[model samples]
Target: ENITQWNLQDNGTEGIQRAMFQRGVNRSLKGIWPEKICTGVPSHLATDTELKAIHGMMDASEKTNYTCCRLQRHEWNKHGWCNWYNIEPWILLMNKTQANLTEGRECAVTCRYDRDSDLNVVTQARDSPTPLTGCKKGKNFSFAGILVQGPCNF
Candidate 1:
């Protein structure tokens, strides 16, 4: 029995997230929104971040529209590394038509392999394996706070 208590607080929310999720390729947020680019140069510590999670991979048949684009940009702002220099990654919880994940009660966050071809904070998704769930939708504000959940490890 040998495991450190996982000092996630040092890096903040994203730290724990990083330790608990397998990241995808860091695609550009360029087309997610217009070129107004209020966020300053990505001149932080240079440590990479973020991933987009959809119901399934997108097809070339369709492209991001106004409604779709909004969620993309919104996740970047809401979760992406804004101006911190600790460590982390972002995951966009975008659920399109193919998903019934309309509200928290409707869905839960799933976790798989933690390690990726690029980086990792753990070997099995996290120090404590668990599928995130509960779907807390207590508030009705700008965040929408919808179907976001997960469960524990085996």
Candidate 2:
């Protein structure tokens, strides 16, 4: 579910079998409760030893607020230079009215397109070929973009 597998045709500009789901965006936790303990910088290794702990804390905090909050993980292609892939995003459950966590169930984590203009992970939109609606929320927690479900490549 993390490294979206797709047919060569499905890899077209805006179509793919599995759309990345949104968990939420990242925040400083600077003033938030259970303040984020210093998680240090990213490691030069292919595996992110630091982010694991940081994401873990965020996951714990999120579950505290939303019992449904769960952890989602993805694999990084060793063929690629970067190490991050199918990464989980941080999110805030502010106003109840804004609590649209439906996409959370489609797949715990969504793939972030490092090549696109909009930073948020892709999601299913009304008619847009791609889920590039931009950040649905603020900076502190904006990386977690939702996903757009795709059937398959015809």
Candidate 3:
């Protein structure tokens, strides 16, 4: 209720905020997101340049080509294919902020996949409750492939 006005392109820090907002706002929950991939960003980003330099490494943005958008769109195309998952990423990371992932904020989102009876990844998705053995903080970008194991992983 308090998130509808969130902007898409130029709202938050280098689109990261927008990315986070857009992700939650756009979940389709179509099919079975048995696997998930989380992309996190450090909240202490000092400037747009710093943010721009590091943002694209994870995935796309809420809105592209601005480095943030390109990566997000790329991930979305690959992950959300087959229409089995209904919607893709550019989000998996965005959703993390909404959940308050502290460590994964370094460069990857902190979460994982939990296949429930509903097949709606929205309800089935959860933070990485297990110790984050995969989060190797080389903190830069898309190595986020290590975050989760499910979510429209076609």
Candidate 4:
């Protein structure tokens, strides 16, 4: 989903506001997938100079935002007929405001493979859930990877 507008003030101090934003991003990124690599990226970040630039460049207003990423593969390139292997990266990004107070989230997941002679990747995303599908362009069974939220009513 897209955030048409947001009001972030909450009688909360900078720390509290930062904490809430972190928690929201963390909740959305946490989960276990049998096939996913276990390594992780920190779930929270402040809008510092670097990050702010990133946020602006990847404006959800125009393109997708890929912050937290799980590397299914690293940067390697296929060297030869032996398939010496090329650098590849499997990545996913948050597709909407991380602090959504709703039922679903927008996300994009991708798997990329590159060879001396060819390159290919699979991508998936979600706008809404009912028609759920992914990798339509040749990415594979890509869809919104997952949603955030801790255990229920605990």
Output the TM-score of candidate 1. Answer: 0.21
lDDT of 3 at 51: 25
- Measured against the true structure, the TM-scores of the candidates, in listed sequence, are 0.21, 0.15, 0.23, 0.17
- TM-score of predicted model 2? 0.15
| Candidate 4 local lDDT, 71-153, one digit each (tens) | 11111111111122111111112223322322323333322322331222212222223332222333222122222221111
> Candidate 4 regions off by >4 Å?
1-57, 60-96, 101-124, 129-140, 143-154
Model 1: residues >4 Å from true position, as ranges?
1-39, 43-52, 56-63, 77-79, 83-88, 92-154
Cα RMSD for candidates in order: 17.3, 16.0, 16.8, 18.5
lDDT of 3 by residue, 64-131 (tens): 53334344333344333332233323244334443332223121222222233111112112322223
Per-residue alpha-carbon lDDT of model 1 for 88-149, expressed as tens digits? 33233223312322221111132222222211212111223344332223311111111122
Residue 73, model 1, lDDT? 38
Instruction: Order the candidate numbers by lDDT, best to worst.
Output: 3, 1, 2, 4
Q: Cα lDDT for residue 72, model 1?
A: 44
Q: If ranked by TM-score, best first, what sequence of candidates would result?
A: 3, 1, 4, 2
Query: Would you give me the overall lDDT of model 1?
Result: 0.25
Best by lDDT: 3
Off by over 4 Å in 2: 1-43, 56-154
